[PDB]
Symmetry: C4
Subunit: 38 residues, 4 copies
């Protein structure tokens, strides 16, 4: 629980996973931008 | 400042900052996409 | 798989993956900037 | 040394710092792109 080493690492891992999903979405937006230029 | 608890709270803070950056980058990309049509 | 060592090696691996993504995003942005002139 | 909990956390913190610097550079590139469109 919000204090514990295991809990902190759990939050960190979840957050990093969320960063990865946002970066996949950012990459997709960039693909769209590149494709719409030709 | 070199304890496990101290290191972990810096890492969590920095990862949170990274998410803030990601939200701004996402907004900028929405602006760019919409500006193109 | 729930040990501190196991958690930390997943976190380090994921953070490394994030850097790979960042390098690709950077390349794409260089392409876009240069395509504009 | 590459094994230790403190060492692993040191690598993780350094890497996250590097991610932050890359994301600042990405943001700058996006600012340039937006500005060159008007
Ligand atoms: Ni354009």
């Amino acid at each position: 629980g919000s204090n514990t080493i295991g809990a902190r690492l759990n939050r960190v891992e979840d957050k990093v996973t969320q960063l990865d999903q946002r970066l996949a979405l950012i990459t997709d937006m960039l693909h769209q931008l590149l494709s719409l230029h030709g």
